[PDB]
Amino acid sequence: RQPDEIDSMSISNASLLMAYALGSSPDIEQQFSTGNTYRKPPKEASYLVSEE
Amino acid sequence: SVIRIKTNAAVAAVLPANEDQADYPSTFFEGGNEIRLYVNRGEKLDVLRQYVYMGLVEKNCRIQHVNAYLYAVLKGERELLEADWDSFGHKIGIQGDKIGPFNLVRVEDIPDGLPDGKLNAEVSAEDDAWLPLFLLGLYRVGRASETAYRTLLMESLIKQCKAIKSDWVSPVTATHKYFDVWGNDGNYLKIVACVDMFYNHFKKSIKATFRWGTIVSRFKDCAALATLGHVVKITGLTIEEVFTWVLQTEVADELVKMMKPGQEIDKSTSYMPYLIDMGISAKSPYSTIKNPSFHFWGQLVAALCRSKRALNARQPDEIDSMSISNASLLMAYALGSSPDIEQQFSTGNTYRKPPKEASYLVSEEPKNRSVVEWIAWYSDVDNKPTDDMLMMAKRVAGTISGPRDNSVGKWIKQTYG
Amino acid sequence: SVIRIKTNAAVAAVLPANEDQADYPSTFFEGGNEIRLYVNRGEKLDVLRQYVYMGLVEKNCRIQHVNAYLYAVLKGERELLEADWDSFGHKIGIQGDKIGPFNLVRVEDIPDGLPDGKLNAEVSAEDDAWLPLFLLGLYRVGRASETAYRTLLMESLIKQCKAIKSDWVSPVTATHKYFDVWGNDGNYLKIVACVDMFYNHFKKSIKATFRWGTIVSRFKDCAALATLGHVVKITGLTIEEVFTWVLQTEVADELVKMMKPGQEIDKSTSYMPYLIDMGISAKSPYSTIKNPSFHFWGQLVAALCRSKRALNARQPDEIDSMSISNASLLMAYALGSSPDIEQQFSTGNTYRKPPKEASYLVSEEPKNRSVVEWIAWYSDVDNKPTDDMLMMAKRVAGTISGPRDNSVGKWIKQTYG
């Protein structure tokens, strides 16, 4: 149920920003390994797609 | 090193309500080494078989009768041990002696519950060929609730109409569910488990036909192990190679909890598969419900890999479905971009002789199935699926002629398609 | 040789629940063990012939009667052994002797189980031209369960209506299945196997017509051998060349276990074809269920090579089908891109006269069927099928007018098409 008398216009906007962030950066980290490495992350600086 | 949360003035620590854990089969045998069966022993076999045979003719068959009879007919069926049989520290039999079907559990005398009524019918001194098979067969029929409940009784009647000569009236009701009570009796679950584990060891014995209706008791509520084995066979990867692809931190903790060493999950002829029916453990940790976030992973990977069996796997609500589905498509699109394609036999010729020229920059798609090379490749696309990648997902979506509701097949249709 | 698996702290055990293997014909007869047919003898032939006819006219034709009768009527049909007959070390007959149909197995008189009842009807005593053929032929009707169950009886009725003169009453029921029980009797399976193996050797004998209805006993639960033989004929490759194409590491493992040397798999005059009916093994290693991933391989290749029988080949659940289908399509498109075209006869003229080309830059498509040239060719396209390659797959998809509910026939239509 959508609760009447809330900032429905703004709360829906903040919710979409959080939902689109979880999908654009999923919980994607390897866990197990057989003696192989860890993708050696070099900490990216900037992608110009949407500076996402 | 926990991270504290503050606000515009002060800290506000947060913790929600908890949830329940699971039990393990091995912990029960540290002080309570012996299982406790309770069957009525003292009445003669022929009197017990007729107490059941008139309870079977009536849609009102009590459970104390079926337990007392099955202990009588199935107690002399001893068989030769060709090799020591010892699991979880409780040895069952030394080499060269005949053990019976009931030496797997201590047979304690029943609490005073001697069966009432059901006056004996005519002489059925030859009906032991089917009676244990029928009463054991209702456990399989007691389970199914859908139209398979109709199919199984017809298959069960064939198993016993073949048993005597030709004639067999069918006392069993077509659709009444009075024998569903039998699955709630803890002693009846133990005798049903003893018949299956015993004849799984002596598969060559003539009485192995009784295993119908009790084979379902083996590896019960352990579907998470079947999911791990299903992924290994369909993916073509080794069991170790499947573990490296567990891209979620939460899915690994659920996969780790099932792998606790001293549980004898490996090797047959163990007490672990029958942990629940024997009472060895409540709510088995290998059940699908106890580790849902791992159950969706892999089963979705098997789907995307054209399983057709994973498509009817109820997607478990309350998991990181948005992220688990992304790791599955990357794993599924890696298995198709590097098929298990290696020469095996040879008539005297050589191999593709790869010289490893650093890499090809077409889409720098790795030519191997190693997770490390693929995760680094997937980061170049900002961890968002590529065109080609969604295109395979629509190809898998086209095989789902009709999904089951709220299933993995519905998930592939709504998300990827 | 297991590899170790770590996480962010510690190692994790990597073993799932196990499963069981199959037996081999050679391991039996390792002690010199004899097959032991166990049938009740000592009763007169004519009374057993009448005990059977007075059960056959009714819907209750018990099997102890048919076993005792078939041993009586069919023991003495001896035939001229023109050459030594020796399988698995247990010699059957020396050259030049009258042999027999029942000397392949020890007679081993049964513990007293003599059939009761069914008093004799009128005397025929000359109708053995059809009676063994019907009871042996009724085993074949025991198998089919669909409308072919009706078609086989029509073939059985014509075989015996022609047997007497013109007249033939048909005691057999049109559809009742009281004789489906007969296939579970171990003695009946042994006698039905002896008639087929005996008359497979003496094909010229007049009583070889009895072989109808027992031919189903040959290579039973050995469909993987029929699949391996089918690919050699449909693809046109030599049996050696088919082994070289096994692009999956798993498909090789079934062929290795299927080829165990001392099993007399090649020899006709051997005990191997009757693995199930003779009791030599309780689970043939050559069954389709015992060798998955090989059964999907080849049968999909036979499909893709436009075989009409492979389309109804049960796709084995729980395999790496996504990878096998890629290797299968690559093999099928190689047989079509270089058909066996070498000239054979000649009037004194020559052949395609190749002057050592060694390299054409069209698509470097090899002109031969060697696996090595195709694997290197497939590696240049990153082990993904080409346009031209899928275009052949759509061509095979258009001939699949209607698939059954699953199997490879769904594969060519659903994925490649």
PDB file of N, CA and C in Angstrom, chain B residues 96-164:
ATOM      1  N   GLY B  96      31.897 -60.546   6.904  1.00  0.00           N
ATOM      2  CA  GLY B  96      31.545 -61.951   6.871  1.00  0.00           C
ATOM      3  C   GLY B  96      30.334 -62.398   7.671  1.00  0.00           C
ATOM      4  N   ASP B  97      29.691 -61.530   8.451  1.00  0.00           N
ATOM      5  CA  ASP B  97      28.468 -61.937   9.134  1.00  0.00           C
ATOM      6  C   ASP B  97      27.272 -61.432   8.333  1.00  0.00           C
ATOM      7  N   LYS B  98      26.147 -62.134   8.443  1.00  0.00           N
ATOM      8  CA  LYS B  98      24.896 -61.617   7.899  1.00  0.00           C
ATOM      9  C   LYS B  98      24.292 -60.562   8.820  1.00  0.00           C
ATOM     10  N   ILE B  99      24.072 -59.354   8.290  1.00  0.00           N
ATOM     11  CA  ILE B  99      23.305 -58.323   8.981  1.00  0.00           C
ATOM     12  C   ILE B  99      21.921 -58.253   8.356  1.00  0.00           C
ATOM     13  N   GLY B 100      20.943 -57.837   9.154  1.00  0.00           N
ATOM     14  CA  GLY B 100      19.583 -57.701   8.692  1.00  0.00           C
ATOM     15  C   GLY B 100      19.281 -56.285   8.247  1.00  0.00           C
ATOM     16  N   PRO B 101      18.011 -56.016   7.931  1.00  0.00           N
ATOM     17  CA  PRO B 101      17.611 -54.652   7.560  1.00  0.00           C
ATOM     18  C   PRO B 101      17.393 -53.737   8.753  1.00  0.00           C
ATOM     19  N   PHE B 102      17.337 -54.277   9.969  1.00  0.00           N
ATOM     20  CA  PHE B 102      17.022 -53.502  11.159  1.00  0.00           C
ATOM     21  C   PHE B 102      18.207 -53.323  12.100  1.00  0.00           C
ATOM     22  N   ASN B 103      19.397 -53.804  11.738  1.00  0.00           N
ATOM     23  CA  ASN B 103      20.564 -53.599  12.587  1.00  0.00           C
ATOM     24  C   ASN B 103      21.166 -52.210  12.427  1.00  0.00           C
ATOM     25  N   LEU B 104      20.651 -51.402  11.498  1.00  0.00           N
ATOM     26  CA  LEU B 104      21.089 -50.020  11.356  1.00  0.00           C
ATOM     27  C   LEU B 104      20.560 -49.114  12.461  1.00  0.00           C
ATOM     28  N   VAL B 105      19.598 -49.578  13.253  1.00  0.00           N
ATOM     29  CA  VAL B 105      18.953 -48.753  14.270  1.00  0.00           C
ATOM     30  C   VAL B 105      18.635 -49.637  15.467  1.00  0.00           C
ATOM     31  N   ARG B 106      18.767 -49.080  16.669  1.00  0.00           N
ATOM     32  CA  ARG B 106      18.366 -49.818  17.857  1.00  0.00           C
ATOM     33  C   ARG B 106      16.854 -50.007  17.850  1.00  0.00           C
ATOM     34  N   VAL B 107      16.405 -51.232  18.099  1.00  0.00           N
ATOM     35  CA  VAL B 107      14.980 -51.561  18.080  1.00  0.00           C
ATOM     36  C   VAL B 107      14.514 -51.566  19.533  1.00  0.00           C
ATOM     37  N   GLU B 108      14.143 -50.397  20.044  1.00  0.00           N
ATOM     38  CA  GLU B 108      13.563 -50.333  21.377  1.00  0.00           C
ATOM     39  C   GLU B 108      12.093 -50.734  21.371  1.00  0.00           C
ATOM     40  N   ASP B 109      11.664 -51.335  22.479  1.00  0.00           N
ATOM     41  CA  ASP B 109      10.273 -51.737  22.619  1.00  0.00           C
ATOM     42  C   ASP B 109       9.389 -50.497  22.632  1.00  0.00           C
ATOM     43  N   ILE B 110       8.212 -50.612  22.030  1.00  0.00           N
ATOM     44  CA  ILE B 110       7.321 -49.468  21.861  1.00  0.00           C
ATOM     45  C   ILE B 110       6.833 -49.008  23.232  1.00  0.00           C
ATOM     46  N   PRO B 111       6.574 -47.714  23.426  1.00  0.00           N
ATOM     47  CA  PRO B 111       5.782 -47.293  24.587  1.00  0.00           C
ATOM     48  C   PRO B 111       4.399 -47.907  24.485  1.00  0.00           C
ATOM     49  N   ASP B 112       3.807 -48.227  25.641  1.00  0.00           N
ATOM     50  CA  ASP B 112       2.646 -49.109  25.617  1.00  0.00           C
ATOM     51  C   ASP B 112       1.585 -48.517  24.701  1.00  0.00           C
ATOM     52  N   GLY B 113       1.496 -49.098  23.508  1.00  0.00           N
ATOM     53  CA  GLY B 113       0.640 -48.647  22.433  1.00  0.00           C
ATOM     54  C   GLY B 113       0.147 -49.798  21.584  1.00  0.00           C
ATOM     55  N   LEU B 114      -0.107 -50.952  22.195  1.00  0.00           N
ATOM     56  CA  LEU B 114      -0.371 -52.159  21.421  1.00  0.00           C
ATOM     57  C   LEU B 114      -1.580 -51.936  20.519  1.00  0.00           C
ATOM     58  N   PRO B 115      -1.513 -52.327  19.245  1.00  0.00           N
ATOM     59  CA  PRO B 115      -2.568 -51.938  18.302  1.00  0.00           C
ATOM     60  C   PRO B 115      -3.926 -52.504  18.686  1.00  0.00           C
ATOM     61  N   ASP B 116      -4.955 -51.696  18.454  1.00  0.00           N
ATOM     62  CA  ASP B 116      -6.339 -52.035  18.743  1.00  0.00           C
ATOM     63  C   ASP B 116      -7.078 -52.540  17.507  1.00  0.00           C
ATOM     64  N   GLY B 117      -8.035 -53.437  17.741  1.00  0.00           N
ATOM     65  CA  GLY B 117      -9.063 -53.837  16.795  1.00  0.00           C
ATOM     66  C   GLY B 117      -8.559 -54.510  15.532  1.00  0.00           C
ATOM     67  N   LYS B 118      -9.297 -54.265  14.444  1.00  0.00           N
ATOM     68  CA  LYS B 118      -9.031 -54.808  13.114  1.00  0.00           C
ATOM     69  C   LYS B 118      -8.876 -56.325  13.132  1.00  0.00           C
ATOM     70  N   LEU B 119      -9.999 -57.024  13.269  1.00  0.00           N
ATOM     71  CA  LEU B 119     -10.011 -58.479  13.369  1.00  0.00           C
ATOM     72  C   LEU B 119      -9.544 -59.157  12.083  1.00  0.00           C
ATOM     73  N   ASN B 120      -8.775 -60.231  12.257  1.00  0.00           N
ATOM     74  CA  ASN B 120      -8.084 -60.911  11.166  1.00  0.00           C
ATOM     75  C   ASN B 120      -9.046 -61.474  10.119  1.00  0.00           C
ATOM     76  N   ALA B 121      -8.668 -61.320   8.849  1.00  0.00           N
ATOM     77  CA  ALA B 121      -9.386 -61.869   7.704  1.00  0.00           C
ATOM     78  C   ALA B 121      -8.894 -63.284   7.384  1.00  0.00           C
ATOM     79  N   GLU B 122      -9.118 -63.719   6.145  1.00  0.00           N
ATOM     80  CA  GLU B 122      -8.701 -65.022   5.653  1.00  0.00           C
ATOM     81  C   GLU B 122      -7.182 -65.066   5.477  1.00  0.00           C
ATOM     82  N   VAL B 123      -6.675 -66.266   5.210  1.00  0.00           N
ATOM     83  CA  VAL B 123      -5.243 -66.536   5.284  1.00  0.00           C
ATOM     84  C   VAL B 123      -4.538 -65.970   4.058  1.00  0.00           C
ATOM     85  N   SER B 124      -3.624 -65.030   4.298  1.00  0.00           N
ATOM     86  CA  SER B 124      -2.787 -64.419   3.274  1.00  0.00           C
ATOM     87  C   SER B 124      -1.330 -64.779   3.533  1.00  0.00           C
ATOM     88  N   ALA B 125      -1.061 -66.058   3.800  1.00  0.00           N
ATOM     89  CA  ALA B 125       0.285 -66.532   4.102  1.00  0.00           C
ATOM     90  C   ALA B 125       1.260 -66.411   2.936  1.00  0.00           C
ATOM     91  N   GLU B 126       0.788 -66.119   1.727  1.00  0.00           N
ATOM     92  CA  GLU B 126       1.667 -65.947   0.578  1.00  0.00           C
ATOM     93  C   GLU B 126       1.822 -64.497   0.143  1.00  0.00           C
ATOM     94  N   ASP B 127       1.140 -63.557   0.795  1.00  0.00           N
ATOM     95  CA  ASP B 127       1.085 -62.180   0.325  1.00  0.00           C
ATOM     96  C   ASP B 127       2.234 -61.310   0.830  1.00  0.00           C
ATOM     97  N   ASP B 128       3.335 -61.905   1.290  1.00  0.00           N
ATOM     98  CA  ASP B 128       4.499 -61.094   1.628  1.00  0.00           C
ATOM     99  C   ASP B 128       5.282 -60.642   0.402  1.00  0.00           C
ATOM    100  N   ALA B 129       4.968 -61.166  -0.787  1.00  0.00           N
ATOM    101  CA  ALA B 129       5.639 -60.697  -1.994  1.00  0.00           C
ATOM    102  C   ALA B 129       5.283 -59.252  -2.326  1.00  0.00           C
ATOM    103  N   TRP B 130       4.079 -58.807  -1.972  1.00  0.00           N
ATOM    104  CA  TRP B 130       3.640 -57.453  -2.284  1.00  0.00           C
ATOM    105  C   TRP B 130       3.372 -56.586  -1.066  1.00  0.00           C
ATOM    106  N   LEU B 131       2.941 -57.168   0.055  1.00  0.00           N
ATOM    107  CA  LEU B 131       2.519 -56.354   1.194  1.00  0.00           C
ATOM    108  C   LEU B 131       3.605 -55.401   1.676  1.00  0.00           C
ATOM    109  N   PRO B 132       4.848 -55.829   1.928  1.00  0.00           N
ATOM    110  CA  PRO B 132       5.892 -54.828   2.202  1.00  0.00           C
ATOM    111  C   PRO B 132       6.085 -53.842   1.062  1.00  0.00           C
ATOM    112  N   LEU B 133       5.955 -54.297  -0.189  1.00  0.00           N
ATOM    113  CA  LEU B 133       6.110 -53.389  -1.321  1.00  0.00           C
ATOM    114  C   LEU B 133       4.967 -52.387  -1.403  1.00  0.00           C
ATOM    115  N   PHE B 134       3.757 -52.797  -1.019  1.00  0.00           N
ATOM    116  CA  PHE B 134       2.619 -51.886  -1.079  1.00  0.00           C
ATOM    117  C   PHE B 134       2.684 -50.848   0.033  1.00  0.00           C
ATOM    118  N   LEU B 135       2.895 -51.294   1.274  1.00  0.00           N
ATOM    119  CA  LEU B 135       2.925 -50.356   2.391  1.00  0.00           C
ATOM    120  C   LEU B 135       4.103 -49.398   2.271  1.00  0.00           C
ATOM    121  N   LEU B 136       5.235 -49.883   1.757  1.00  0.00           N
ATOM    122  CA  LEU B 136       6.347 -48.994   1.448  1.00  0.00           C
ATOM    123  C   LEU B 136       6.030 -48.093   0.262  1.00  0.00           C
ATOM    124  N   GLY B 137       5.181 -48.559  -0.657  1.00  0.00           N
ATOM    125  CA  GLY B 137       4.848 -47.775  -1.833  1.00  0.00           C
ATOM    126  C   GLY B 137       3.918 -46.615  -1.562  1.00  0.00           C
ATOM    127  N   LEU B 138       3.156 -46.668  -0.467  1.00  0.00           N
ATOM    128  CA  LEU B 138       2.288 -45.547  -0.126  1.00  0.00           C
ATOM    129  C   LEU B 138       3.077 -44.335   0.347  1.00  0.00           C
ATOM    130  N   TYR B 139       4.321 -44.524   0.793  1.00  0.00           N
ATOM    131  CA  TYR B 139       5.149 -43.376   1.143  1.00  0.00           C
ATOM    132  C   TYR B 139       5.440 -42.523  -0.084  1.00  0.00           C
ATOM    133  N   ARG B 140       5.689 -43.164  -1.229  1.00  0.00           N
ATOM    134  CA  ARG B 140       5.851 -42.420  -2.473  1.00  0.00           C
ATOM    135  C   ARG B 140       4.529 -41.815  -2.924  1.00  0.00           C
ATOM    136  N   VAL B 141       3.430 -42.543  -2.717  1.00  0.00           N
ATOM    137  CA  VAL B 141       2.112 -42.040  -3.080  1.00  0.00           C
ATOM    138  C   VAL B 141       1.627 -41.005  -2.070  1.00  0.00           C
ATOM    139  N   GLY B 142       1.982 -41.173  -0.793  1.00  0.00           N
ATOM    140  CA  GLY B 142       1.641 -40.176   0.210  1.00  0.00           C
ATOM    141  C   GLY B 142       2.210 -38.805  -0.094  1.00  0.00           C
ATOM    142  N   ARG B 143       3.324 -38.756  -0.821  1.00  0.00           N
ATOM    143  CA  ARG B 143       3.999 -37.491  -1.087  1.00  0.00           C
ATOM    144  C   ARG B 143       3.288 -36.700  -2.180  1.00  0.00           C
ATOM    145  N   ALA B 144       3.174 -37.276  -3.376  1.00  0.00           N
ATOM    146  CA  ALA B 144       2.566 -36.559  -4.489  1.00  0.00           C
ATOM    147  C   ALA B 144       1.141 -36.128  -4.156  1.00  0.00           C
ATOM    148  N   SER B 145       0.818 -34.888  -4.528  1.00  0.00           N
ATOM    149  CA  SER B 145      -0.498 -34.301  -4.332  1.00  0.00           C
ATOM    150  C   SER B 145      -1.190 -33.903  -5.626  1.00  0.00           C
ATOM    151  N   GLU B 146      -0.460 -33.819  -6.732  1.00  0.00           N
ATOM    152  CA  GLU B 146      -0.979 -33.381  -8.019  1.00  0.00           C
ATOM    153  C   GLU B 146      -1.467 -34.597  -8.809  1.00  0.00           C
ATOM    154  N   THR B 147      -1.675 -34.437 -10.118  1.00  0.00           N
ATOM    155  CA  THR B 147      -2.147 -35.551 -10.933  1.00  0.00           C
ATOM    156  C   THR B 147      -1.153 -36.708 -10.967  1.00  0.00           C
ATOM    157  N   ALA B 148       0.110 -36.469 -10.601  1.00  0.00           N
ATOM    158  CA  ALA B 148       1.057 -37.567 -10.436  1.00  0.00           C
ATOM    159  C   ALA B 148       0.633 -38.516  -9.323  1.00  0.00           C
ATOM    160  N   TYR B 149      -0.182 -38.037  -8.380  1.00  0.00           N
ATOM    161  CA  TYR B 149      -0.812 -38.913  -7.397  1.00  0.00           C
ATOM    162  C   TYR B 149      -1.668 -39.971  -8.081  1.00  0.00           C
ATOM    163  N   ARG B 150      -2.235 -39.642  -9.243  1.00  0.00           N
ATOM    164  CA  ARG B 150      -2.982 -40.621 -10.024  1.00  0.00           C
ATOM    165  C   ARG B 150      -2.049 -41.554 -10.788  1.00  0.00           C
ATOM    166  N   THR B 151      -0.971 -41.010 -11.360  1.00  0.00           N
ATOM    167  CA  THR B 151      -0.049 -41.823 -12.148  1.00  0.00           C
ATOM    168  C   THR B 151       0.704 -42.833 -11.286  1.00  0.00           C
ATOM    169  N   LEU B 152       1.041 -42.459 -10.049  1.00  0.00           N
ATOM    170  CA  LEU B 152       1.868 -43.332  -9.220  1.00  0.00           C
ATOM    171  C   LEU B 152       1.111 -44.567  -8.747  1.00  0.00           C
ATOM    172  N   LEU B 153      -0.171 -44.423  -8.402  1.00  0.00           N
ATOM    173  CA  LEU B 153      -0.924 -45.595  -7.972  1.00  0.00           C
ATOM    174  C   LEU B 153      -1.082 -46.606  -9.098  1.00  0.00           C
ATOM    175  N   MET B 154      -1.224 -46.141 -10.341  1.00  0.00           N
ATOM    176  CA  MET B 154      -1.282 -47.072 -11.462  1.00  0.00           C
ATOM    177  C   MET B 154       0.053 -47.779 -11.653  1.00  0.00           C
ATOM    178  N   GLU B 155       1.158 -47.055 -11.461  1.00  0.00           N
ATOM    179  CA  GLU B 155       2.474 -47.682 -11.498  1.00  0.00           C
ATOM    180  C   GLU B 155       2.699 -48.593 -10.298  1.00  0.00           C
ATOM    181  N   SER B 156       2.149 -48.235  -9.134  1.00  0.00           N
ATOM    182  CA  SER B 156       2.293 -49.088  -7.958  1.00  0.00           C
ATOM    183  C   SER B 156       1.480 -50.367  -8.103  1.00  0.00           C
ATOM    184  N   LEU B 157       0.291 -50.273  -8.704  1.00  0.00           N
ATOM    185  CA  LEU B 157      -0.526 -51.465  -8.900  1.00  0.00           C
ATOM    186  C   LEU B 157       0.156 -52.436  -9.854  1.00  0.00           C
ATOM    187  N   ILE B 158       0.837 -51.910 -10.875  1.00  0.00           N
ATOM    188  CA  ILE B 158       1.560 -52.767 -11.807  1.00  0.00           C
ATOM    189  C   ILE B 158       2.707 -53.481 -11.101  1.00  0.00           C
ATOM    190  N   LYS B 159       3.329 -52.831 -10.114  1.00  0.00           N
ATOM    191  CA  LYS B 159       4.449 -53.458  -9.421  1.00  0.00           C
ATOM    192  C   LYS B 159       3.998 -54.659  -8.600  1.00  0.00           C
ATOM    193  N   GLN B 160       2.751 -54.647  -8.124  1.00  0.00           N
ATOM    194  CA  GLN B 160       2.207 -55.725  -7.310  1.00  0.00           C
ATOM    195  C   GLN B 160       1.211 -56.624  -8.031  1.00  0.00           C
ATOM    196  N   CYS B 161       0.548 -56.141  -9.085  1.00  0.00           N
ATOM    197  CA  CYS B 161      -0.243 -57.045  -9.914  1.00  0.00           C
ATOM    198  C   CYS B 161       0.648 -58.066 -10.605  1.00  0.00           C
ATOM    199  N   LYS B 162       1.899 -57.696 -10.870  1.00  0.00           N
ATOM    200  CA  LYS B 162       2.922 -58.614 -11.348  1.00  0.00           C
ATOM    201  C   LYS B 162       3.449 -59.524 -10.247  1.00  0.00           C
ATOM    202  N   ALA B 163       3.137 -59.228  -8.982  1.00  0.00           N
ATOM    203  CA  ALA B 163       3.782 -59.917  -7.869  1.00  0.00           C
ATOM    204  C   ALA B 163       3.202 -61.301  -7.584  1.00  0.00           C
ATOM    205  N   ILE B 164       1.888 -61.505  -7.717  1.00  0.00           N
ATOM    206  CA  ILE B 164       1.373 -62.787  -7.241  1.00  0.00           C
ATOM    207  C   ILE B 164       1.276 -63.805  -8.369  1.00  0.00           C
TER     208      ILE B 164
END
